[PDB]
């Protein structure tokens, strides 16, 4: 049945919660990003109000087939009336399109709901310094002291610098970057962006990537594989075989592969600095995996929550042992006691 944790108490609202076919007492549904496990169950057969940024709402137009009339797309920023209860969408800083949602119950209680987020300090100047938050609804998936990671711009940094070297040294090298959903583009795009390159990808996943309006877009990626020196494909495909393989695809115009597997966590990062990682090599093919995390590491989610002082914390993540949710409710208790609320 349908959690607990995805609906919003005092409201007809649902959050991520497509897979449970009609939810009674649902009168509108919303979507935070377009991710499978949160969009499960959507298709152009459904018929009740989807509500979401623009963003999101063009992949369920042109993904999904969604029928047009159903997706109801809301700025960012903006204090909005849904079903007589006002609500805003801010940036999750995730994947693109994705939103936090605050609600503001009719008996004066104020909910955040992160949906998937990677807690930034910039947060702290949106429009949720301006009042109070009763109850959080948290992604939770890096809640646990091991979980560090570098900055984005650190890693984005490495992925130019060890690009940029191998191909100044050998330019018949292709380079290769993985993907499984959206989320992390600046990889590609900054790798092709020094290369002075189009990064060149499959007719699905150009379709994909048009709908997101990041400016200059046609001028970046193409389905001219031919053209390109920076490809994309399936992650599945990174790996020697499907490296190999996809080698010979090329018609000996290269002799050489660097790839990039962008990871979340790998336990590697409780040891090495960024400065210090290393492929996996077999022959003339190299893989590198990169932590490019878009979720808060323990240190960020942990600055965040204990800014905004919530009364009440409700976990998304990682709620499927009791072992996990014990752990959870322990370190919320430990930083409410640091920080006084
Ligand atoms: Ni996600």
């Known amino acids: 049945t349908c959690p607990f944790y995805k609906k919003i108490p005092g409201t007809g609202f649902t959050v991520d919660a497509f897979q449970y076919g009609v939810v009674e007492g649902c009168t509108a549904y919303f979507l935070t990003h377009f991710h499978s496990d949160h969009y499960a169950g959507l298709s152009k057969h459904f018929t009740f109000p989807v509500y979401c940024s623009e963003i999101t709402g063009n992949l369920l137009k042109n993904k999904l087939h969604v029928q047009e009339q159903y997706i109801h797309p809301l700025p960012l920023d903006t204090e909005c009336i849904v079903n007589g209860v006002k609500v805003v969408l801010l940036d999750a800083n995730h994947c693109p399109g994705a939103v936090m949602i605050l609600f503001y119950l009719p008996n004066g209680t104020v909910i955040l709901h992160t949906g998937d987020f990677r807690a930034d300090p910039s947060m702290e100047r949106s429009l949720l310094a301006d009042q ?78 048009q709908c997101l309006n990041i400016p200059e877009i046609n001028s970046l990626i193409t389905t001219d594989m031919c053209s390109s020196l920076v490809h994309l494909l399936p992650m599945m495909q990174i790996n020697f075989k499907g490296l190999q393989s ?77 072992k996990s949710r014990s752990t959870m409710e322990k370190y919320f208790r430990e930083w409410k006691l640091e920080a006084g609320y």
Not at 139 to 159: G, K, L, N
Not at 171 to 198: M, N, Q, R
Not at 263 to 269: A, F, K, L, P, R
Not at 310 to 321: L, M, S
């Open 246 to 322: 996809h080698l010979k695809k090329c018609g000996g115009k290269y002799n050489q592969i660097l790839a990039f597997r962008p990871t979340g966590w790998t336990h590697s990062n409780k040891f090495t600095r960024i400065a210090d990682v290393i492929p996996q090599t077999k022959g003339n093919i190299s893989i590198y995996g990169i932590p490019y995390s878009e979720h808060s590491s323990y240190l960020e989610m942990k600055r965040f929550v204990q800014w905004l002082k919530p009364q009440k914390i409700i976990p998304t993540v990682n709620v499927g042992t009791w």
């Open 132 to 209: 109070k938050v009763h109850m959080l609804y948290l992604d939770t998936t890096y809640c646990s002291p091991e979980y560090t990671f570098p900055s984005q711009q650190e890693v984005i940094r490495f992925a130019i610098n060890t690009a940029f070297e191998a191909v100044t040294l050998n330019p018949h090298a292709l380079v290769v970057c993985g993907t499984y959903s959206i989320g992390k583009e600046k990889v590609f795009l900054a790798i092709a962006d020094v290369l002075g390159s189009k990064v060149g990808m499959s007719q699905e996943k150009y379709k994909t990537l």
